[model samples]
Target: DKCKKVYENYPVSKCQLANQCNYDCKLDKHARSGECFYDEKRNLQCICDYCEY
Candidate 1:
């Protein structure tokens, strides 16, 4: 089976600022990347993509 990506919710709010997610995600042990995204409920969130190990 193909490896799947894991998504994590960061505690940070208002992730619109550049480099915020990048720095935070880097601190995460498994996170490959991160970005600000709006969920289905229209709330801003910091979603980190984890490496599929």
Candidate 2:
């Protein structure tokens, strides 16, 4: 679980914390599939799945 691994490594913030299973699952998917995108608006609007900060 990449999300789990990421969560363990990084403290969850109000903006980055996982709120839904899908979001967490997306993180896991991105880690495995390496199909990730970066949209400033989306990043700011939705919770970050694989963010360093």
Candidate 3:
């Protein structure tokens, strides 16, 4: 069996704390994990990962 991951992008403008977004993702989105990164538009976004098998 293979596990595939799905990524959901939540725009978090002016977000400075990765941990904060991570917690928000888990709490609000119920995501497995989340990371902070900048999008093509140079906007901060919370990328949440969901496991799928």
> For this target, which candidate reaches the highest TM-score against the unseen true structure?
3
Which lDDT tens digits does candidate 3 get at residues 1-53? 12222234554652467777767766766776565666676767666666641
| Strongest candidate by lDDT | 3
Full-model lDDT for every candidate:
0.54, 0.35, 0.59
TM-scores, each model vs. reference: 0.49, 0.20, 0.61
Instruction: Count clashing residue pairs per candidate.
Output: 0, 0, 0
Model 1: pairs clashing at backbone N, Cα or C within 3 Å = none
Clashes of 3: 0
Please identify which of the two predictions, 1 or 3, would achieve the higher lDDT against the true structure. 3
Q: Tell me the spans in candidate 3 whose CA falls farther than 4 Å from its real position.
A: 1-14
In candidate 1, stretches whose alpha carbon ends up further than 4 angstroms from where it belongs are: 1-13, 51-53
* Alpha-carbon RMSD, each predicted model: 4.4, 10.7, 4.7
C-alpha lDDT of candidate 2 relative to the true structure: 0.35
C-alpha lDDT of residue 31 in model 2: 32
